């Protein structure tokens, strides 16, 4: 943990690599929802490549 003096009381700062790992099925669902990926494996590959 480090300090963020600019934050508001309801906010925290999260690294985006941790967030990418933690929110993965949500990302799969959103990728399939908007037509970017037609199957689960396509979304898996897209997340692996970090496009």
Partner 1 sequence: CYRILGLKPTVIFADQIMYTGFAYAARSGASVGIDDMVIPEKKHEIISEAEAEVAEIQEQFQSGLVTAGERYNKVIDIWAAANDRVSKAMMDNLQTETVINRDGQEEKQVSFNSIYMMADSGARGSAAQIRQLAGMRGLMAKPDGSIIETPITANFREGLNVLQYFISTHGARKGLADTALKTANSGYLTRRLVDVAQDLVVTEDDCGTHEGIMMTPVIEGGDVKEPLRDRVLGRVTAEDVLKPGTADILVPRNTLLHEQWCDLLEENSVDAVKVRSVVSCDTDFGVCAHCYGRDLARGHIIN
Partner 2 sequence: SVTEFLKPRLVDIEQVSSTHAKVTLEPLERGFGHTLGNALRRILLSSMPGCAVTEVEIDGVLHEYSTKEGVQEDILEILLNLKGLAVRVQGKDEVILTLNKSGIGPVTAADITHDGDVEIVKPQHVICHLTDENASISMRIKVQRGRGYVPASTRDERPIGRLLVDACYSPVERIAYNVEAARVEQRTDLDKLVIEMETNGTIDPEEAIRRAATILAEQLEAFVDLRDVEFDPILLRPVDDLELTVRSANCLKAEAIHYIGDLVQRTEVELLKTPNLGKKSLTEIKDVLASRGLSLGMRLENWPPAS
Partner 3 sequence: DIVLNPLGVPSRMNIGQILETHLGMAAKGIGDKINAMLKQQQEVAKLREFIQRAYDLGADVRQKVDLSTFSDEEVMRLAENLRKGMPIATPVFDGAKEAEIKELLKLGDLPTSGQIRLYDGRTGEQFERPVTVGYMYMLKLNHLVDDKM
Residue ranges in contact with partner 2 by CB under 8 A = 6, 32-39
Q: What burial class does residue 44 get, using C-beta atoms within 10 Å of its C-beta: 0-12 exposed, 13-18 middle, 19+ buried?
A: middle
What would the x/- binding string for partner 1 be over residues 5 to 34, using CB under 8 A?
A: x--xx-------------------------
d(CA 41, CA 37): 8
8 A C-beta contact, residue 5 and residue 11: no
Look up tokens 């929802």; give the residue: 33
17 binds, among partner 2, partner 1, partner 3, none (CB under 5 to 8 A by kind): partner 3
The binding site for partner 3 (CB under 8 A) comprises: 15, 17-18
The binding site for partner 1 (CB under 8 A) comprises: 5, 8-9
């Amino acid at each position: 943990i480090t300090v963020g003096p600019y934050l508001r009381l309801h906010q925290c700062g999260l690294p985006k690599k941790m967030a990418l790992e933690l929110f993965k099925p949500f990302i799969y669902g959103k990728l399939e929802l908007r037509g970017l990926a037609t199957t689960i494996k396509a979304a898996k590959k897209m997340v692996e490549r970090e496009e």
